[PDB]
Write a structure and sequence with these properties.
This protein is of the alpha+beta class. It folds into two domains: 2-156, Penicillin-binding protein 2a (Domain 2), CATH 3.90.1310; 160-481, 3-Layer(aba) Sandwich (Beta-lactamase). It has 17 helices and 20 strands. The strands form seven sheets. A five-stranded antiparallel beta sheet has the order 9-8-20-19-18, with helices on both faces. A hairpin with a 6-residue loop joins strand 11 (254-256) and strand 12 (263-265). It is elongated and about 90 Å long. The structure holds zinc ion. The site of zinc ion (ZN) has 8 residues, from loops. Zinc ion (ZN) is lined by residues 251, 266, 268, 271-272, 283, 285, 287.
C-alpha cells in the first residue's frame, strides 16, 4: 500500500524561486483499520493527537472502507505524541498539499484530478507532460520520501508579491474583474487575476456556481475596447501620415457621420471645443476620432490593429486562450468608438500596451522561464514561439507621450497625483446581460510614467446592480507596487 506524501507533480515557482504550489506542510496519520475499529484506546489516542471526533474519523474510514490501512489528513502533531502513537503501531508522516488555502493564482495554475494527478486546466494541463510524476514523494506501508536528482519543477515569470497585492485588491471588488501586470521591457507576466474565484480543493461546490467561477477572464473573455481602441486609431493615423502632432479638431458636441445625416454626439454634448491631438486623445472625443478614422478607412485601421498583435493569440504558454476574429465588415463609426463586432481579451490589450509602453520593441508576453531540478539549477529555458519585432518606434513613442496626458488632465485625472505618474487609456465596453444595456470598464497603461516597469490592464465587468470604472483598481495596483 502506497502513502502519497505529495501530488507527485513538479513544484510551480515564481521568478524569484518562491513556491506557488506545495507550500502548506500537513500530516498523514496511518493506522491499521482492524486496530482502529476494535480498540477504543487507539481511536481515543488518534482523536487526542488530531483533535478530530468520531464523525471525522469514521467519514475517513467510510471513504477508505475497502483498504486494510486508513490514512487521516491532520497537522500539528509534536514529537512526544508522535513517538507515543508509534508505540501503538500508528506512524505519522510529513505531507505537502498541492494548493494552499490562500489559493494564489487559482485560474492560471488550474487544478488536477485526485486519482490521476493529471492536469485539468491552466499550467497543470498546459505543462502536464513535464510536471506529472516529475516530483514523486511517497512511502510504502505495513510498517523514497526525499529529493531525487531527476526531479523536475517549473519556474514561471510570476512575482509572488505582485500577485498577492493584486489578489488583495480584486478580493475587495464584488464585480467580476480581469487584471494582468507584465514587465514593460521583457513581456514577462508578473501577475494575472480573474474574479470570481473557484476553490482548487473543492471542484464540486464551484461547478454548481453560475457566474463563470472557472473562467480565466484575462485569457478567454473578449470585450469591446471602447475608447481603448483610440490607441490603435491614433497609432494608424500617425503611422499612415494622415495626421501629425499639429492636428486640431473643433468638437461642437456632435458631427455628421461622413455624407449621411446620421449624427454622432460627443460625451460632453456641448463640446470639448478646439482640441490639439493630446486633448482630443485625453478627452476621448468621439467626433475628433471619427474625423481621424474617416481619413484612414476600415482597412488601414484593421492593418494597424493586426500590426499591434490584436488579431492573433498572445501564446503565453496556456492553451485555453480564446480570441475573436477581425470583423468581416464593420462601420468606420463602430471602429472609431471601439464597439460592436470588434473584441479583445485583457491579455491582448496588455500585449498591445506593452509595444506602445516599450517604444515599439514588441516583447511577446510569456509565463514560463525554465524547467529546474531540486537545486533550482536550469535544466532548460522556455520562451515564446513569437519572433521579436521593432514596430513604428516613433509612432509608439508619440502614443505613449499622449497617454501620459490622459492621467494628468484627461478622463483619468484621478491618477494625476500617484507617485511617479503613469500613462493610460480608459474605455467603456457596451454589452448586454439579459437584454439590459450593461457597461464593462477598461483601463490600460504603464507605471511609472518616466521609465515604465509595468504594463497594467484591468477590466471591471458591469452587473445588474450597475457599472464601474477601472481607474480606482489601476490606482490601488500602482500605489501597492511603488
Ligand atoms: Zn468631443
Amino acid at each position: 500500500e502506497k502513502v502519497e506524501l505529495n501530488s507527485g507533480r513538479g513544484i510551480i515557482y515564481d521568478r524569484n524561486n518562491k513556491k506557488l504550489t506545495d507550500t502548506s506542510k500537513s500530516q498523514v496519520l496511518i493506522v491499521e483499520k482492524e486496530k482502529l475499529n476494535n480498540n477504543y484506546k487507539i481511536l481515543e489516542l488518534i482523536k487526542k493527537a488530531t483533535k478530530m471526533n468520531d464523525l471525522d474519523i469514521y467519514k475517513a474510514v467510510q471513504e477508505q472502507l475497502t483498504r486494510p490501512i486508513i490514512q487521516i489528513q491532520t497537522k500539528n502533531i509534536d514529537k512526544s505524541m508522535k513517538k507515543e502513537l508509534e508505540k501503538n503501531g500508528i506512524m505519522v508522516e510529513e505531507k505537502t498539499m498541492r494548493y494552499a488555502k490562500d489559493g494564489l493564482l487559482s485560474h492560471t495554475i488550474g487544478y488536477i484530478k485526485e486519482d490521476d494527478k493529471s492536469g485539468q486546466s491552466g499550467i497543470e494541463k498546459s505543462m502536464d507532460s513535464v510536471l506529472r510524476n516529475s516530483n514523486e514523494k511517497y512511502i510504502s506501508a505495513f510498517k523514497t520520501v526525499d529529493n531525487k536528482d531527476k526531479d523536475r519543477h517549473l519556474k514561471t515569470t510570476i512575482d509572488y508579491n505582485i500577485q498577492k497585492k493584486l489578489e488583495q485588491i480584486l478580493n475587495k471588488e464584488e464585480n467580476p474583474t480581469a487584471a494582468i501586470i507584465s514587465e514593460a521591457s521583457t513581456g514577462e507576466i508578473l501577475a494575472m487575476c480573474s474574479r470570481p474565484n473557484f476553490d482548487q480543493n473543492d471542484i464540486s461546490k464551484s461547478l454548481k456556481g453560475k457566474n463563470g467561477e472557472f473562467e480565466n477572464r484575462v485569457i478567454k473573455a473578449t470585450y469591446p475596447p471602447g475608447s481603448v481602441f483610440k490607441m490603435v486609431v491614433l497609432f494608424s493615423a500617425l503611422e499612415n501620415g494622415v495626421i501629425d502632432e499639429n492636428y486640431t479638431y473643433n468638437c461642437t458636441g456632435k458631427t455628421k457621420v461622413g455624407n449621411t445625416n446620421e449624427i454622432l454626439r460627443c460625451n460632453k454634448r456641448d463640446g470639448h471645443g478646439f482640441q490639439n491631438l493630446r486633448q482630443a486623445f485625453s478627452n476621448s472625443c468621439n467626433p475628433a476620432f471619427l474625423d481621424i478614422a474617416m481619413k484612414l478607412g476600415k482597412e488601414k485601421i484593421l492593418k494597424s490593429a493586426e500590426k499591434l498583435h490584436l488579431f492573433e493569440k498572445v501564446d503565453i504558454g496556456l492553451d485555453e486562450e480564446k480570441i475573436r476574429e477581425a470583423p468581416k465588415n464593420i462601420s468606420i463609426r463602430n471602429l472609431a468608438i471601439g464597439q460592436e463586432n470588434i473584441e479583445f481579451t485583457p491579455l491582448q490589450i496588455n500585449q498591445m500596451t506593452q509595444i506602445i509602453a516599450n517604444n515599439g520593441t514588441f516583447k511577446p508576453l510569456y509565463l514560463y522561464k525554465s524547467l529546474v531540478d531540486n537545486n533550482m539549477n536550469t535544466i532548460k529555458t522556455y520562451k515564446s514561439s513569437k519572433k521579436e519585432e521593432l514596430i513604428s518606434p516613433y509612432v509608439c513613442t508619440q502614443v505613449k507621450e499622449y497617454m501620459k496626458s490622459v492621467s494628468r488632465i484627461g478622463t483619468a485625472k484621478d491618477l494625476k497625483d500617484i507617485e511617479g505618474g503613469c500613462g493610460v487609456k480608459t474605455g467603456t465596453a457596451q454589452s448586454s446581460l439579459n437584454k439590459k444595456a450593461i457597461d464593462h470598464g477598461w483601463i490600460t497603461g504603464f507605471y511609472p510614467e518616466e521609465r515604465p516597469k509595468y504594463v497594467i490592464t484591468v477590466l471591471v465587468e458591469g452587473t445588474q446592480k450597475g457599472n464601474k470604472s477601472a481607474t480606482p483598481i489601476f490606482k490601488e495596483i500602482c500605489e501597492s507596487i511603488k
